Design a protein around this ligand. Structure first.
Ligand SMILES: [Zn+2]
Length: 45
């Protein structure tokens, strides 16, 4: 993809879904995705 970034399209506190299929920008205090409802997890690469 364009714009080679080592970081994602998100900051330190705010996170994105553990899976790259979604990658939803979650609120912050989200123990589950805002789109999926999947639990805040580490996730593989
Ligand atoms: Zn998600």
């Amino acid at each position: 993809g364009s714009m080679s970034t080592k970081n994602f399209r998100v900051s330190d506190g705010d996170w994105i879904c553990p899976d790259k299929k979604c990658g939803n920008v979650n609120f912050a205090r989200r123990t589950s995705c805002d789109r999926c409802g999947r639990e805040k997890t580490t996730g593989p690469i």
